[PDB]
Write a protein that binds this DNA or RNA. Structure first.
Lengths: 89, 93
DNA sequence: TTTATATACCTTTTTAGTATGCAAA
DNA sequence: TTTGCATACTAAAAAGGTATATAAA
């Protein structure tokens, strides 16, 4: 599992659509759909209900989303505070 | 930047060695070295002490290392919890 | 010297892009 | 119908492997 999976999944959940999330991140919709499949096949857990329009998270996917943004918000903290330390000698 | 980069960096710092870390990660040494280089270049900061052999972190790299471990741990915790839920053996309200 | 990391070069794997099918409303 | 996610295929990007040059110890 890479950050790509979280970054993409979060986008899908936030925009409640693959197509809009695709456009938000400036990638094609299919390779986005494939990443979300791979994530789910890796975990062995279905995170989104489909069709169903718009897309909705499953209870598991909801929990996973809530956590994923905590993690991604931390990658931000991590990187930015690292850079702050580099600037200064 | 991806989790693999963190996972690699962590290996190198712990083993204080690219060749040992690469053996543990089951890839060759040259890939590991480039991946680390890429991570450094992508952030634009030096994480490791090149020039000294018992390979050591820079102050920035040290902070980054300590953060990474918490991050990677929370990734495991997320997955572990999600599975617990998904198996329907939740003890989460 | 020896021993470990960086570079050069090539292969394999993964991800992104395009065309299009198919299902939801 | 129109609209949006999925599947099939191709293209590009990125990761990984082997050989070897190079710099610490």
């Amino acid at each position: 599992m890479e950050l790509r999976h979280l970054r993409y999944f979060v986008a899908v959940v936030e925009e409640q659509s693959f197509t809009k999330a695709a456009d938000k991140l400036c990638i094609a919709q299919p390779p986005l759909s494939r990443q979300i499949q791979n994530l789910e096949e890796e975990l062995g857990i279905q995170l989104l209900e489909r069709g169903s329009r718009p897309v909705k998270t499953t209870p598991e996917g909801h929990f996973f989303y809530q956590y994923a943004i905590k993690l991604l918000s931390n990658v931000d903290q991590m990187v930015s505070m690292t850079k702050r330390i580099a600037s200064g000698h």
